[PDB]
């Protein structure tokens, strides 16, 4: 009874440290999840029944995703290696179901967040300043590690409390996150996290309402627009780095980063228009480029990429209407389950559930924004981490919302 609670508490404490710092932390954490579910045998038959208002839109939405994503193979005879990455999105079901049975103490989750962020900062500092490395990621890919760091920092931004020390810890969370990201380059993730943290000031300070966020974003936008009045500072001449690219893309020459990205997006969204329901197939995006009439007349870099770099374009082109709906659902259904728990916690007082729901919503927003520039489905580490975190936060969120 109690032992499951204590071990689940220490596991949620150590999850960020295991994932970020420990090299093979994904396997260790997936073993920690298993050594909990294997302990409650007659449980979880009366735990699905208790939280079927939250569990079911985390099980049906993933089962439909898997079914639609494997129902492409019956005709599009691509090998099974494609569906080995979506085999890792089923882990969200398990990591939510285990938490639902074994009630944790999410007071330690935030302490784990800050400990993991500080230790990851130390590791990255060592790997950049001494063992000279261009892309100092701990033990995974640089982009996947950047996504991990952004998600951890945004979760930790929702510290429950209103006090000097709690605000200090919340601010240090984003400070460490931005230091880690800047040491790893990939400033796109930095700007995504910065724009995602602005709506989270709703959860951060429980005094600044919707108007005290609207005014803030208006001021920030005006400050940003103030740059072009004097186009000398680096602020003007980095968003002016793509003006030439787009104006050239509108002309004949398309051999630039923005130009290549837009050309791939158009060659994806025209094929999707030609094949509304089903596309080339699951994965297999290279067939569009290899069979188009643009790559037949030129050998630009856009004709050799394995997959597109836009989730809303890659999913639509490869799968089609059902695939686009299920891919959208995989992110939006959690976004609808977090709101329904946040409002319940708000109606119950219970600030911890409110902050947890805010953290979950921020994670969903950050995942969508990151997917607006890259395909998060390709990286196995990104997929497994997102599934684990989205199934772990909503577990305690539902636990706090109900009782």
């Amino acid at each position, epitope marked *: 009874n109690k032992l499951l609670s204590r071990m689940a508490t220490v596991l949620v404490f150590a999850f960020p440290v295991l994932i970020l710092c420990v090299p093979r932390g994904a396997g260790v954490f997936l073993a920690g999840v298993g050594v909990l579910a294997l302990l409650g045998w007659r449980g979880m038959g009366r735990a699905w029944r208790e939280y079927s208002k939250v569990m079911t839109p985390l099980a049906i939405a993933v089962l439909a995703f898997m079914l639609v994503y494997v129902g492409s193979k019956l005709y599009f005879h691509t090998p099974w290696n494609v569906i080995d990455n979506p085999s890792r999105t089923l882990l969200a079901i398990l990591t939510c179901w285990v938490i639902v049975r074994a009630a944790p103490n999410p007071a330690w989750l935030w302490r784990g967040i800050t400990v993991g962020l500080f230790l990851a900062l130390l590791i990255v500092g060592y790997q950049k300043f001494a063992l000279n490395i261009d892309r100092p990621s701990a033990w995974i890919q640089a982009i996947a590690f950047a996504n991990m760091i952004a998600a951890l920092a945004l979760v930790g931004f929702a510290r429950p409390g209103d006090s000097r020390g709690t605000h200090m810890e919340a601010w240090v969370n984003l400070l460490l996150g931005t230091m880690i990201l800047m040491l790893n380059g990939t400033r796109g993730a930095v700007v995504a996290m910065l724009v995602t943290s602005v709506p989270m000031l709703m959860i951060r300070y429980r005094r600044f309402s919707v108007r005290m966020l609207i005014v803030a974003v208006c001021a920030v936008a005006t400050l940003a627009i103030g740059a072009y009045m004097v186009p000398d500072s680096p602020v003007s001449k980095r968003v002016d780095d793509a003006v030439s690219e787009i104006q050239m893309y509108r002309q004949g020459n398309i*051999e630039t980063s923005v130009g290549v990205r837009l050309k791939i997006w158009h060659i994806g969204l025209q094929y999707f228009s030609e094949h509304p329901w089903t596309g080339v197939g699951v994965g297999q995006f290279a067939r569009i480029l290899h069979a188009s009439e643009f790559c037949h007349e030129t050998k630009s*870099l856009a004709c050799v990429l394995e997959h597109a770099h836009n989730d809303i374009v890659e999913a639509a082109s490869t799968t089609g209407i059902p695939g686009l709906m299920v891919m959208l659902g995989l992110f939006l259904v959690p976004a609808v389950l977090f709101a329904r728990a946040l409002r319940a916690a708000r109606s119950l007082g219970n600030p911890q559930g409110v902050s947890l729901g805010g953290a979950g919503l921020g994670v969903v927003m950050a995942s969508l924004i990151s997917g607006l520039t890259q395909v998060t489905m390709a990286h196995q580490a990104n997929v497994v981490f997102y599934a684990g975190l989205i199934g772990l936060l909503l577990g305690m969120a539902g636990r706090e919302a109900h009782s």
Partner: antibody, heavy 119, light 104 residues
Framework: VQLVESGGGLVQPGGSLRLSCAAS????????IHWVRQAPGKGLEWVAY????????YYADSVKGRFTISADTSKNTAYLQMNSLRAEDTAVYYC????????????????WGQGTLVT | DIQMTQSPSSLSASVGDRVTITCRAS??????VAWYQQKPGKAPKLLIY???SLYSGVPSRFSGSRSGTDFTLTISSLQPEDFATYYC?????????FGQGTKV
């Protein structure tokens, strides 16, 4: 998209030389420009580069302390300034540009220059 | 720093016989090794980036793969224009390094 370099020639040891790597079709402040040299009848040897936006630079073991790489976004050109050359610095010097950061998170040289010979 | 070794340093094979080239590494570079082809008195051009992805204008004969820290390149078949020197560059460490350079 073309990269051209010039400035090489005959120089006695102990002197100095500057190479200008003019670029076209892109912005030097956007991507990163790498200098690389190849000894005659030998393999390629890296020397230095500059970062995309930050301007941070790294140098090879042999050329550190005397080679000065620089960029000028006003003229969209890159320069490598060498001081106190010895006889072991005779090689053909090439320009190099990495691919886009998104297509390759790790640096990979795609567009090069014609190269110049220094002796 | 990091030392890259290539084997064989120089090998010859007739047309139609596939040839493999191995690039080793002193330390662990995850996937930041690319391959270049240099013709005599000409600027080298990129062939494979991230050790497993082809570059534009490169025929599908060229292919690379990763096995731990021992990186290998192979060609489907040899055509008369494929006889040129090859190099491997590691980009994981901020101080990049080129290999010794094999010759076909």
């Amino acid at each position: 998209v073309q990269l051209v370099e010039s400035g090489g020639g005959l120089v006695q040891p102990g002197g100095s030389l500057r190479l200008s790597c003019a670029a076209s079709g892109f912005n030097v402040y956007s991507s990163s420009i790498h200098w690389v040299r190849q000894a005659p009848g030998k393999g390629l040897e890296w020397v230095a580069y500059i970062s995309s936006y930050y301007g941070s630079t790294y140098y090879a073991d042999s050329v550190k302390g005397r080679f000065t790489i620089s960029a000028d976004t006003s003229k969209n050109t890159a320069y490598l300034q060498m001081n106190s050359l010895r006889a072991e610095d005779t090689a053909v010097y090439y320009c190099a540009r990495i691919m886009f950061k998104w297509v390759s998170p790790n640096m990979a040289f795609d567009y090069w220059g014609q190269g110049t010979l220094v002796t | 720093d990091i030392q890259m070794t290539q084997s064989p340093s120089s090998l010859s094979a007739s047309v139609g016989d596939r040839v493999t080239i191995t690039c080793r590494a002193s330390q662990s570079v995850s996937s930041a090794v690319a391959w270049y082809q240099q013709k005599p008195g000409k600027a080298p051009k990129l062939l494979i980036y991230s050790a497993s992805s082809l570059y534009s204008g490169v025929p599908s004969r060229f292919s690379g793969s990763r096995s731990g820290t021992d990186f290998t390149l192979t060609i489907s078949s040899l055509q008369p224009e494929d006889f040129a020197t090859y190099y491997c560059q590691q980009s994981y460490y901020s101080l990049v390094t080129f290999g010794q350079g094999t010759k076909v």
